[PDB]
Structure 1
Amino acid sequence: AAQTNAPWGLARISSTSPGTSTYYYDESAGQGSCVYVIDTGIEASHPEFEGRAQMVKTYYYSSRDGNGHGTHCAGTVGSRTYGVAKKTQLFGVKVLDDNGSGQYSTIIAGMDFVASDKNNRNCPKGVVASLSLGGGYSSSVNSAAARLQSSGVMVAVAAGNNNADARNYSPASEPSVCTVGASDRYDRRSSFSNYGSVLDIFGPGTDILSTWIGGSTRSISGTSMATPHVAGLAAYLMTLGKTTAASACRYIADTANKGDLSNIPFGTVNLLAYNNYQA
Protein backbone atom coordinates (compact mmCIF):
# COMPACT_ATOMS: atom_id res chain seq x y z
CA ALA A 1 0.00 0.00 0.00
CA ALA A 2 0.98 3.64 -0.52
CA GLN A 3 -0.44 6.82 1.02
CA THR A 4 0.84 9.94 -0.98
CA ASN A 5 1.49 13.30 0.70
CA ALA A 6 1.69 11.67 4.12
CA PRO A 7 3.00 13.39 7.24
CA TRP A 8 6.78 13.44 6.95
CA GLY A 9 7.33 10.99 9.82
CA LEU A 10 5.24 8.19 8.29
CA ALA A 11 7.17 8.64 5.04
CA ARG A 12 10.38 8.72 6.94
CA ILE A 13 9.86 5.35 8.71
CA SER A 14 9.20 3.84 5.32
CA SER A 15 12.20 5.44 3.60
CA THR A 16 16.00 5.14 3.60
CA SER A 17 16.59 8.85 2.92
CA PRO A 18 14.67 11.95 4.09
CA GLY A 19 12.86 14.30 1.84
CA THR A 20 9.80 12.46 0.52
CA SER A 21 6.13 12.36 1.47
CA THR A 22 4.60 8.95 0.61
CA TYR A 23 4.12 6.28 3.28
CA TYR A 24 4.88 2.74 1.76
CA TYR A 25 3.47 -0.12 3.83
CA ASP A 26 2.02 -3.62 3.75
CA GLU A 27 -2.12 -3.13 3.70
CA SER A 28 -2.36 -5.71 6.62
CA ALA A 29 -1.54 -2.41 8.63
CA GLY A 30 -1.61 -3.91 12.11
CA GLN A 31 -4.74 -5.92 11.89
CA GLY A 32 -5.23 -8.21 14.82
CA SER A 33 -2.82 -6.28 17.15
CA CYS A 34 -3.49 -3.99 19.77
CA VAL A 35 -1.95 -0.81 21.28
CA TYR A 36 -2.51 0.65 24.58
CA VAL A 37 -1.91 4.42 24.71
CA ILE A 38 -1.14 5.28 28.40
CA ASP A 39 -1.66 8.98 28.50
CA THR A 40 -4.46 11.69 28.81
CA GLY A 41 -6.99 9.43 27.10
CA ILE A 42 -8.21 9.18 23.53
CA GLU A 43 -11.11 11.01 21.96
CA ALA A 44 -12.42 7.77 20.50
CA SER A 45 -15.23 9.61 18.67
CA HIS A 46 -12.70 11.37 16.42
CA PRO A 47 -13.90 9.58 12.96
CA GLU A 48 -10.18 9.06 12.27
CA PHE A 49 -10.21 6.19 14.51
CA GLU A 50 -13.15 4.83 12.68
CA GLY A 51 -14.49 2.82 15.70
CA ARG A 52 -11.10 1.11 16.40
CA ALA A 53 -10.41 3.08 19.62
CA GLN A 54 -11.93 2.47 23.24
CA MET A 55 -11.22 4.07 26.57
CA VAL A 56 -10.93 1.19 28.93
CA LYS A 57 -9.56 2.92 32.13
CA THR A 58 -9.13 6.07 33.98
CA TYR A 59 -7.79 7.05 37.38
CA TYR A 60 -9.55 10.46 37.33
CA TYR A 61 -13.18 11.57 37.54
CA SER A 62 -13.54 11.16 33.76
CA SER A 63 -12.05 8.97 31.05
CA ARG A 64 -12.19 11.70 28.38
CA ASP A 65 -9.05 13.43 27.05
CA GLY A 66 -9.80 16.84 27.79
CA ASN A 67 -5.70 17.80 27.09
CA GLY A 68 -5.45 16.37 23.32
CA HIS A 69 -1.88 14.78 24.05
CA GLY A 70 -3.18 11.21 24.30
CA THR A 71 -5.34 11.69 21.29
CA HIS A 72 -2.39 12.90 19.19
CA CYS A 73 -0.11 10.10 20.20
CA ALA A 74 -2.91 7.59 19.56
CA GLY A 75 -3.45 9.03 16.11
CA THR A 76 0.19 8.45 15.22
CA VAL A 77 -0.08 4.85 16.38
CA GLY A 78 -3.41 4.08 14.51
CA SER A 79 -5.54 6.78 12.96
CA ARG A 80 -6.62 6.13 9.38
CA THR A 81 -4.76 9.14 7.94
CA TYR A 82 -1.92 9.98 10.34
CA GLY A 83 -1.12 6.54 11.78
CA VAL A 84 1.35 3.88 11.27
CA ALA A 85 -0.68 0.84 11.84
CA LYS A 86 -4.00 2.02 10.34
CA LYS A 87 -6.09 -1.07 11.23
CA THR A 88 -4.82 -1.76 14.91
CA GLN A 89 -7.12 -1.71 17.87
CA LEU A 90 -6.47 1.16 20.25
CA PHE A 91 -7.01 1.17 23.98
CA GLY A 92 -6.80 4.20 26.17
CA VAL A 93 -5.68 4.38 29.66
CA LYS A 94 -5.98 7.83 31.22
CA VAL A 95 -3.22 8.19 33.81
CA LEU A 96 -2.61 11.88 33.03
CA ASP A 97 -5.13 14.60 33.90
CA ASP A 98 -5.92 17.12 31.73
CA ASN A 99 -3.11 19.45 32.12
CA GLY A 100 -1.05 16.40 31.14
CA SER A 101 0.13 15.72 35.10
CA GLY A 102 0.29 12.36 36.69
CA GLN A 103 1.41 11.20 39.98
CA TYR A 104 3.73 8.25 39.74
CA SER A 105 1.84 5.89 41.76
CA THR A 106 -1.33 6.65 39.13
CA ILE A 107 1.18 5.84 36.23
CA ILE A 108 2.29 2.72 38.00
CA ALA A 109 -1.30 1.59 38.46
CA GLY A 110 -2.18 2.08 34.81
CA MET A 111 0.93 0.19 33.74
CA ASP A 112 0.04 -3.04 35.84
CA PHE A 113 -3.49 -2.48 34.65
CA VAL A 114 -2.28 -3.27 30.96
CA ALA A 115 -0.39 -6.39 32.01
CA SER A 116 -3.69 -7.66 33.39
CA ASP A 117 -6.20 -6.28 30.88
CA LYS A 118 -4.54 -7.46 27.83
CA ASN A 119 -6.16 -10.73 29.00
CA ASN A 120 -9.59 -9.10 28.47
CA ARG A 121 -8.87 -8.21 24.90
CA ASN A 122 -8.47 -9.95 21.58
CA CYS A 123 -5.17 -9.31 20.29
CA PRO A 124 -4.00 -12.52 18.49
CA LYS A 125 -1.14 -10.60 16.70
CA GLY A 126 0.54 -8.99 19.57
CA VAL A 127 0.07 -6.26 22.17
CA VAL A 128 2.02 -3.00 22.51
CA ALA A 129 2.04 -0.29 25.19
CA SER A 130 2.95 3.35 24.05
CA LEU A 131 4.06 5.70 27.17
CA SER A 132 4.68 9.25 25.95
CA LEU A 133 5.40 10.47 29.47
CA GLY A 134 8.20 10.65 31.98
CA GLY A 135 9.99 12.56 34.63
CA GLY A 136 12.89 11.78 37.22
CA TYR A 137 14.18 8.71 38.11
CA SER A 138 12.21 6.12 40.05
CA SER A 139 12.91 2.46 40.70
CA SER A 140 9.46 1.82 41.17
CA VAL A 141 8.22 3.52 37.88
CA ASN A 142 11.05 1.64 36.13
CA SER A 143 10.03 -1.63 37.78
CA ALA A 144 6.42 -1.19 36.61
CA ALA A 145 7.51 -0.74 33.01
CA ALA A 146 9.90 -3.86 33.27
CA ARG A 147 6.75 -5.93 34.61
CA LEU A 148 4.60 -4.68 31.74
CA GLN A 149 7.28 -5.77 29.26
CA SER A 150 7.95 -9.09 31.02
CA SER A 151 3.98 -9.82 30.93
CA GLY A 152 4.63 -10.01 26.93
CA VAL A 153 3.71 -6.46 25.86
CA MET A 154 6.06 -4.61 23.68
CA VAL A 155 6.65 -1.38 25.79
CA ALA A 156 7.68 1.80 23.92
CA VAL A 157 8.74 4.85 26.24
CA ALA A 158 9.70 8.38 25.46
CA ALA A 159 13.39 9.04 26.10
CA GLY A 160 12.43 12.54 27.34
CA ASN A 161 12.61 16.25 26.31
CA ASN A 162 15.51 18.04 28.31
CA ASN A 163 18.28 17.64 26.15
CA ALA A 164 20.37 14.91 28.62
CA ASP A 165 21.10 11.96 29.24
CA ALA A 166 17.89 9.96 29.68
CA ARG A 167 19.57 7.66 32.23
CA ASN A 168 18.19 10.01 34.88
CA TYR A 169 14.59 9.78 33.69
CA SER A 170 11.75 7.30 34.19
CA PRO A 171 10.45 5.18 32.62
CA ALA A 172 13.21 5.84 29.85
CA SER A 173 16.11 4.41 31.77
CA GLU A 174 14.53 1.27 32.38
CA PRO A 175 16.86 -0.96 30.35
CA SER A 176 14.43 -3.95 29.20
CA VAL A 177 11.90 -1.77 27.36
CA CYS A 178 12.32 0.28 24.10
CA THR A 179 13.32 3.99 24.80
CA VAL A 180 12.66 6.18 21.86
CA GLY A 181 14.62 9.33 21.06
CA ALA A 182 13.38 11.96 18.45
CA SER A 183 14.31 13.36 15.05
CA ASP A 184 13.57 15.90 12.73
CA ARG A 185 12.50 16.04 8.84
CA TYR A 186 16.17 16.70 8.00
CA ASP A 187 17.43 13.73 10.08
CA ARG A 188 18.75 15.91 12.91
CA ARG A 189 18.20 14.84 16.46
CA SER A 190 15.44 17.08 17.71
CA SER A 191 16.89 19.86 19.84
CA PHE A 192 15.41 18.50 22.95
CA SER A 193 15.37 15.13 22.69
CA ASN A 194 17.19 13.31 25.45
CA TYR A 195 20.17 10.93 24.43
CA GLY A 196 22.34 8.49 26.22
CA SER A 197 23.42 4.69 25.74
CA VAL A 198 19.71 3.82 27.48
CA LEU A 199 18.09 4.88 24.12
CA ASP A 200 17.27 1.76 21.63
CA ILE A 201 16.03 3.67 18.70
CA PHE A 202 14.93 7.25 17.13
CA GLY A 203 11.85 7.88 15.51
CA PRO A 204 10.11 11.24 14.01
CA GLY A 205 9.48 13.65 16.65
CA THR A 206 9.80 17.21 15.54
CA ASP A 207 6.36 18.87 13.60
CA ILE A 208 4.32 15.69 13.72
CA LEU A 209 0.85 16.07 12.27
CA SER A 210 -1.73 14.00 14.12
CA THR A 211 -5.20 14.07 15.61
CA TRP A 212 -6.23 16.47 18.34
CA ILE A 213 -9.69 16.59 20.38
CA GLY A 214 -12.84 18.11 18.93
CA GLY A 215 -12.23 16.36 16.03
CA SER A 216 -9.59 18.18 15.00
CA THR A 217 -5.46 18.01 14.00
CA ARG A 218 -2.22 19.77 14.95
CA SER A 219 1.22 19.48 14.35
CA ILE A 220 3.24 19.23 17.83
CA SER A 221 6.68 18.11 18.79
CA GLY A 222 8.20 15.96 21.39
CA THR A 223 9.91 12.28 22.18
CA SER A 224 6.24 11.80 22.99
CA MET A 225 5.48 12.08 19.22
CA ALA A 226 8.43 9.83 18.33
CA THR A 227 7.26 7.01 20.73
CA PRO A 228 3.94 6.06 19.05
CA HIS A 229 5.65 5.89 15.67
CA VAL A 230 7.86 2.98 17.01
CA ALA A 231 4.73 1.48 18.94
CA GLY A 232 2.73 1.50 15.81
CA LEU A 233 5.66 0.08 13.87
CA ALA A 234 5.99 -2.80 16.24
CA ALA A 235 2.14 -3.53 15.90
CA TYR A 236 2.70 -3.46 12.14
CA LEU A 237 5.60 -5.94 12.47
CA MET A 238 3.68 -8.29 14.75
CA THR A 239 1.02 -8.47 12.55
CA LEU A 240 3.29 -9.33 9.59
CA GLY A 241 4.87 -12.12 11.66
CA LYS A 242 8.29 -10.52 11.76
CA THR A 243 8.75 -10.18 15.27
CA THR A 244 7.04 -10.68 18.64
CA ALA A 245 6.31 -8.48 21.63
CA ALA A 246 9.54 -9.94 23.67
CA SER A 247 11.70 -9.57 20.38
CA ALA A 248 10.36 -6.29 18.70
CA CYS A 249 12.76 -3.71 20.15
CA ARG A 250 15.69 -5.86 18.98
CA TYR A 251 14.13 -6.49 15.55
CA ILE A 252 13.49 -2.77 15.01
CA ALA A 253 17.10 -2.01 15.93
CA ASP A 254 18.44 -4.77 13.67
CA THR A 255 16.44 -3.45 10.71
CA ALA A 256 16.87 0.30 11.36
CA ASN A 257 18.49 2.79 9.15
CA LYS A 258 21.94 2.79 10.69
CA GLY A 259 24.18 6.28 10.50
CA ASP A 260 22.13 8.38 9.17
CA LEU A 261 21.20 11.29 12.08
CA SER A 262 23.14 14.41 13.01
CA ASN A 263 24.48 14.93 16.51
CA ILE A 264 24.48 11.45 18.07
CA PRO A 265 26.38 12.45 20.73
CA PHE A 266 29.04 9.86 21.35
CA GLY A 267 27.76 6.94 22.81
CA THR A 268 24.15 7.26 21.64
CA VAL A 269 22.93 4.56 18.88
CA ASN A 270 22.43 6.35 15.50
CA LEU A 271 19.44 4.17 14.49
CA LEU A 272 16.24 5.32 12.81
CA ALA A 273 13.12 3.20 12.91
CA TYR A 274 12.43 1.70 9.45
CA ASN A 275 9.73 -0.68 8.12
CA ASN A 276 11.84 -2.24 5.31
CA TYR A 277 8.85 -2.37 3.01
CA GLN A 278 9.94 -0.50 -0.15
CA ALA A 279 13.58 -1.68 0.05
Structure 2
Amino acid sequence: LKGDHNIRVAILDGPVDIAHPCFQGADLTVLPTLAPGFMSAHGTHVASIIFGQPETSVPGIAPQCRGLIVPIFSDDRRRITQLDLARGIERAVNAGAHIINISGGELTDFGEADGWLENAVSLCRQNNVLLVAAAGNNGCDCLHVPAALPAVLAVGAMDDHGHPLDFSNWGSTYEQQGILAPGEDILGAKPGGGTERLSGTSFATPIVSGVAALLLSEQVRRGETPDPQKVRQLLLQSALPCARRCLAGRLNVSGAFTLLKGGNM
Protein backbone atom coordinates (compact mmCIF):
# COMPACT_ATOMS: atom_id res chain seq x y z
CA LEU A 1 0.00 0.00 0.00
CA LYS A 2 3.06 2.25 -0.41
CA GLY A 3 3.27 2.58 -4.21
CA ASP A 4 4.89 0.81 -7.15
CA HIS A 5 8.11 1.63 -9.01
CA ASN A 6 6.27 1.25 -12.31
CA ILE A 7 4.11 4.29 -11.44
CA ARG A 8 5.87 7.56 -12.27
CA VAL A 9 5.12 10.77 -10.43
CA ALA A 10 6.71 14.03 -11.60
CA ILE A 11 7.29 17.05 -9.34
CA LEU A 12 7.39 20.27 -11.40
CA ASP A 13 8.86 22.99 -9.23
CA GLY A 14 11.91 24.94 -8.09
CA PRO A 15 15.04 23.34 -6.58
CA VAL A 16 14.65 20.06 -4.65
CA ASP A 17 17.18 19.05 -1.98
CA ILE A 18 17.54 15.38 -2.97
CA ALA A 19 20.31 14.96 -0.37
CA HIS A 20 17.71 15.43 2.42
CA PRO A 21 17.65 12.40 4.76
CA CYS A 22 14.00 11.58 3.95
CA PHE A 23 14.91 10.75 0.29
CA GLN A 24 17.57 8.14 1.23
CA GLY A 25 16.09 5.06 -0.46
CA ALA A 26 13.59 7.03 -2.56
CA ASP A 27 13.52 6.28 -6.30
CA LEU A 28 14.19 9.80 -7.61
CA THR A 29 15.54 10.93 -10.95
CA VAL A 30 16.41 14.62 -11.43
CA LEU A 31 16.04 15.98 -14.97
CA PRO A 32 18.83 18.46 -15.83
CA THR A 33 18.19 22.22 -15.67
CA LEU A 34 18.17 23.55 -19.24
CA ALA A 35 19.29 26.82 -20.83
CA PRO A 36 16.69 29.66 -20.70
CA GLY A 37 3.74 31.92 -9.29
CA PHE A 38 4.12 28.59 -11.05
CA MET A 39 6.96 27.54 -8.73
CA SER A 40 5.72 26.71 -5.26
CA ALA A 41 9.34 27.31 -4.14
CA HIS A 42 8.72 24.50 -1.61
CA GLY A 43 10.10 21.83 -3.93
CA THR A 44 11.83 19.85 -1.19
CA HIS A 45 8.76 19.89 1.07
CA VAL A 46 6.35 19.02 -1.74
CA ALA A 47 8.53 16.14 -2.95
CA SER A 48 8.95 14.78 0.62
CA ILE A 49 5.15 14.53 1.05
CA ILE A 50 5.07 11.90 -1.73
CA PHE A 51 8.52 10.25 -1.66
CA GLY A 52 9.78 10.61 1.93
CA GLN A 53 10.88 7.17 3.11
CA PRO A 54 9.30 5.15 5.96
CA GLU A 55 11.16 5.58 9.25
CA THR A 56 12.72 8.87 8.13
CA SER A 57 11.89 12.37 9.38
CA VAL A 58 9.16 12.65 6.69
CA PRO A 59 7.11 9.55 5.90
CA GLY A 60 5.75 9.94 2.38
CA ILE A 61 2.43 8.83 0.90
CA ALA A 62 3.86 6.77 -2.00
CA PRO A 63 7.52 6.06 -1.07
CA GLN A 64 7.75 3.11 -3.50
CA CYS A 65 6.74 5.15 -6.58
CA ARG A 66 9.21 6.29 -9.24
CA GLY A 67 9.83 10.00 -8.83
CA LEU A 68 10.83 12.46 -11.55
CA ILE A 69 12.11 15.86 -10.38
CA VAL A 70 11.56 18.31 -13.22
CA PRO A 71 12.87 21.86 -13.01
CA ILE A 72 10.47 24.47 -14.38
CA PHE A 73 13.24 27.10 -14.20
CA SER A 74 16.60 27.75 -15.86
CA ASP A 75 17.55 30.41 -13.26
CA ASP A 76 15.59 29.95 -10.00
CA ARG A 77 15.54 33.75 -9.45
CA ARG A 78 13.63 34.56 -12.66
CA ARG A 79 9.87 34.72 -13.01
CA ILE A 80 8.61 31.38 -14.31
CA THR A 81 6.76 32.03 -17.55
CA GLN A 82 3.93 30.01 -19.02
CA LEU A 83 6.39 28.67 -21.62
CA ASP A 84 8.76 27.61 -18.80
CA LEU A 85 5.89 25.62 -17.24
CA ALA A 86 4.67 24.24 -20.60
CA ARG A 87 8.15 22.94 -21.44
CA GLY A 88 8.42 21.35 -17.98
CA ILE A 89 5.09 19.59 -18.46
CA GLU A 90 6.20 18.35 -21.90
CA ARG A 91 9.49 17.08 -20.47
CA ALA A 92 7.54 15.22 -17.77
CA VAL A 93 5.17 13.65 -20.35
CA ASN A 94 8.15 12.63 -22.50
CA ALA A 95 9.86 11.04 -19.43
CA GLY A 96 6.79 8.80 -18.96
CA ALA A 97 5.06 10.51 -16.03
CA HIS A 98 1.65 9.12 -15.03
CA ILE A 99 1.04 12.01 -12.68
CA ILE A 100 2.38 15.57 -12.78
CA ASN A 101 2.29 17.60 -9.56
CA ILE A 102 2.27 21.38 -9.89
CA SER A 103 2.06 22.99 -6.44
CA GLY A 104 2.22 26.47 -7.94
CA GLY A 105 -0.19 28.52 -10.02
CA GLU A 106 -1.13 32.05 -11.06
CA LEU A 107 -4.37 33.94 -10.37
CA THR A 108 -6.45 34.64 -13.49
CA ASP A 109 -9.82 36.09 -14.50
CA PHE A 110 -11.54 32.78 -15.17
CA GLY A 111 -8.90 30.16 -15.88
CA GLU A 112 -7.62 31.46 -19.20
CA ALA A 113 -4.12 30.52 -20.38
CA ASP A 114 -1.90 31.29 -23.33
CA GLY A 115 -1.26 28.83 -26.16
CA TRP A 116 1.91 27.07 -25.00
CA LEU A 117 0.43 26.17 -21.61
CA GLU A 118 -3.00 25.22 -22.98
CA ASN A 119 -1.27 22.92 -25.49
CA ALA A 120 0.98 21.31 -22.86
CA VAL A 121 -2.02 20.61 -20.64
CA SER A 122 -4.01 19.20 -23.60
CA LEU A 123 -1.03 16.89 -24.30
CA CYS A 124 -1.50 15.41 -20.81
CA ARG A 125 -5.21 14.87 -21.52
CA GLN A 126 -4.41 13.32 -24.93
CA ASN A 127 -1.78 11.00 -23.41
CA ASN A 128 -3.68 9.98 -20.25
CA VAL A 129 -1.37 11.83 -17.86
CA LEU A 130 -2.95 13.37 -14.75
CA LEU A 131 -1.98 16.91 -13.88
CA VAL A 132 -2.73 17.74 -10.24
CA ALA A 133 -2.45 21.43 -9.34
CA ALA A 134 -2.94 23.81 -6.43
CA ALA A 135 -6.18 25.81 -6.30
CA GLY A 136 -4.40 28.91 -4.92
CA ASN A 137 -4.47 30.78 -1.61
CA ASN A 138 -6.29 34.05 -2.47
CA GLY A 139 -9.32 33.20 -0.33
CA CYS A 140 -11.77 34.23 -3.06
CA ASP A 141 -14.19 33.12 -5.76
CA CYS A 142 -11.09 32.77 -7.87
CA LEU A 143 -9.28 30.46 -10.27
CA HIS A 144 -5.61 29.67 -10.83
CA VAL A 145 -3.98 28.12 -13.83
CA PRO A 146 -3.03 25.39 -14.49
CA ALA A 147 -5.51 24.19 -11.80
CA ALA A 148 -8.60 25.42 -13.74
CA LEU A 149 -7.65 23.99 -17.18
CA PRO A 150 -9.43 21.02 -18.77
CA ALA A 151 -8.83 17.54 -17.31
CA VAL A 152 -6.68 18.96 -14.48
CA LEU A 153 -7.38 17.88 -10.90
CA ALA A 154 -7.46 21.08 -8.84
CA VAL A 155 -6.67 20.80 -5.13
CA GLY A 156 -7.94 23.02 -2.36
CA ALA A 157 -7.04 22.97 1.31
CA MET A 158 -9.11 21.80 4.27
CA ASP A 159 -8.24 21.72 7.96
CA ASP A 160 -7.78 18.75 10.35
CA HIS A 161 -11.56 18.79 10.99
CA GLY A 162 -12.52 18.60 7.33
CA HIS A 163 -13.52 22.23 6.87
CA PRO A 164 -12.30 24.31 3.94
CA LEU A 165 -9.56 26.72 4.95
CA ASP A 166 -10.54 30.34 4.41
CA PHE A 167 -7.54 31.09 2.15
CA SER A 168 -8.34 28.28 -0.31
CA ASN A 169 -9.73 29.52 -3.66
CA TRP A 170 -13.24 28.42 -4.60
CA GLY A 171 -13.92 29.60 -8.16
CA SER A 172 -16.81 27.75 -9.87
CA THR A 173 -14.77 25.53 -12.25
CA TYR A 174 -13.31 23.90 -9.11
CA GLU A 175 -16.81 22.63 -8.28
CA GLN A 176 -16.49 20.28 -11.30
CA GLN A 177 -12.77 19.41 -11.06
CA GLY A 178 -11.48 20.34 -7.61
CA ILE A 179 -11.31 18.49 -4.30
CA LEU A 180 -10.29 19.54 -0.81
CA ALA A 181 -7.31 17.77 0.72
CA PRO A 182 -5.55 18.26 4.06
CA GLY A 183 -3.63 21.54 3.90
CA GLU A 184 -3.13 22.70 7.49
CA ASP A 185 0.26 22.03 9.12
CA ILE A 186 1.39 19.39 6.64
CA LEU A 187 4.77 17.82 7.49
CA GLY A 188 7.62 18.10 5.02
CA ALA A 189 11.36 18.41 4.54
CA LYS A 190 13.31 21.67 4.68
CA PRO A 191 16.12 22.20 2.18
CA GLY A 192 19.39 21.90 4.07
CA GLY A 193 17.89 19.47 6.59
CA GLY A 194 15.16 19.20 9.21
CA THR A 195 11.39 19.34 8.86
CA GLU A 196 8.47 21.70 9.30
CA ARG A 197 4.67 21.78 9.05
CA LEU A 198 3.26 24.26 6.57
CA SER A 199 -0.20 25.29 5.41
CA GLY A 200 -1.43 25.95 1.88
CA THR A 201 -2.88 24.46 -1.30
CA SER A 202 0.77 23.78 -2.28
CA PHE A 203 0.89 21.05 0.39
CA ALA A 204 -2.60 19.66 -0.14
CA THR A 205 -1.72 19.10 -3.82
CA PRO A 206 1.02 16.42 -3.32
CA ILE A 207 -1.26 14.56 -0.89
CA VAL A 208 -3.70 14.13 -3.79
CA SER A 209 -0.89 13.27 -6.24
CA GLY A 210 0.32 10.65 -3.76
CA VAL A 211 -3.18 9.17 -3.35
CA ALA A 212 -3.61 9.09 -7.14
CA ALA A 213 -0.29 7.21 -7.38
CA LEU A 214 -1.51 4.69 -4.81
CA LEU A 215 -4.73 4.15 -6.82
CA LEU A 216 -2.66 3.57 -10.01
CA SER A 217 -0.40 1.21 -8.04
CA GLU A 218 -3.49 -0.83 -7.05
CA GLN A 219 -4.54 -1.01 -10.69
CA VAL A 220 -1.18 -2.64 -11.39
CA ARG A 221 -1.76 -5.13 -8.54
CA ARG A 222 -5.21 -5.93 -9.99
CA GLY A 223 -3.74 -6.66 -13.47
CA GLU A 224 -5.30 -3.54 -15.00
CA THR A 225 -3.58 -0.91 -17.16
CA PRO A 226 -2.84 2.20 -15.08
CA ASP A 227 -5.42 4.87 -15.99
CA PRO A 228 -4.56 8.32 -14.59
CA GLN A 229 -7.60 10.11 -16.01
CA LYS A 230 -10.01 7.49 -14.60
CA VAL A 231 -8.26 7.89 -11.26
CA ARG A 232 -9.05 11.65 -11.46
CA GLN A 233 -12.69 10.75 -12.10
CA LEU A 234 -12.74 8.36 -9.12
CA LEU A 235 -11.25 10.97 -6.76
CA LEU A 236 -13.92 13.45 -7.88
CA GLN A 237 -16.77 10.91 -7.77
CA SER A 238 -15.82 9.66 -4.28
CA ALA A 239 -15.32 13.15 -2.75
CA LEU A 240 -17.49 13.77 0.33
CA PRO A 241 -19.83 16.72 0.95
CA CYS A 242 -18.88 19.20 3.66
CA ALA A 243 -21.15 24.91 0.14
CA ARG A 244 -19.24 26.40 -2.82
CA ARG A 245 -16.08 26.29 -0.71
CA CYS A 246 -16.41 22.47 -0.61
CA LEU A 247 -15.54 22.28 -4.35
CA ALA A 248 -16.52 18.80 -5.69
CA GLY A 249 -16.00 17.60 -2.12
CA ARG A 250 -13.43 16.35 0.38
CA LEU A 251 -10.75 13.82 -0.55
CA ASN A 252 -12.02 10.38 0.42
CA VAL A 253 -9.33 7.73 0.09
CA SER A 254 -11.42 4.73 1.20
CA GLY A 255 -14.25 5.78 -1.13
CA ALA A 256 -11.84 6.22 -4.04
CA PHE A 257 -10.48 2.69 -3.51
CA THR A 258 -14.03 1.32 -3.31
CA LEU A 259 -14.92 2.98 -6.63
CA LEU A 260 -11.64 1.73 -8.11
CA LYS A 261 -12.79 -1.87 -7.55
CA GLY A 262 -16.25 -1.12 -9.03
CA GLY A 263 -17.82 -1.14 -5.59
CA ASN A 264 -20.35 1.34 -4.27
CA MET A 265 -20.11 3.79 -1.38
TM-score range, shorter chain: 0.7 to 0.9
Distance 2:72 2:200 in 1: 19
Among candidates 104, 125, 141, match of residue 149 of structure 1: 125
- Alpha-carbon spacing, 1:68–1:131, altered in 2? closer, same or farther (3 Å): closer
Secondary structure of the structure 2 residue equivalent to 1:219: strand
Among candidates 53, 67, 73, match of residue 46 of structure 2: 73
Please list every run of 5 or more consecutive structure 1 residues that lacks an aligned counterpart in the other structure: 1-25, 119-125
1:223 aligns with 2:206: no
> Which amino acid in 2 is paired with 1:134?
G
1:93: how far off? 0.9
Distance 1:82 1:102 in 2: 30
1:231: how far off? 0.6
Secondary structure of the structure 2 residue equivalent to 1:165: coil
- Alpha-carbon spacing, 1:149–1:71, altered in 2? closer, same or farther (3 Å): farther
CA contact (8 A) 1:156 1:227 kept: yes
CA RMSD of aligned residues (A): 2.7
1:111 aligns with 2:89: yes
Sequence identity, in percent? Answer: 27
Secondary structure of the structure 1 residue equivalent to 2:149: coil
Distance 1:105 1:206 in 2: 31
Distance 2:187 2:78 in 1: 19
Q: Hey, what does 1:171 align to over in structure 2?
A: 146
Q: How does 1:20-99 map to 2 (within 5 A)?
A: 26=1, 28-49=2-23, 50-59=25-34, 69-80=42-53, 81-96=58-73, 98=76
Please list every run of 5 or more consecutive structure 2 residues that lacks an aligned counterpart in the other structure: 259-264
Report which of the two has the higher share of helix.
2
Bigger shift: 148-157 or 105-114?
148-157
TM value normalised by structure 1: 0.76
Among candidates 221, 245, 250, match of residue 271 of structure 1: 250
Distance 1:220 1:53 in 2: 23
1:31: how far off? 3.8
- Alpha-carbon spacing, 1:216–1:104, altered in 2? closer, same or farther (3 Å): same
1:127 aligns with 2:105: no
Q: Hey, what does 2:241 align to over in structure 1?
A: 259
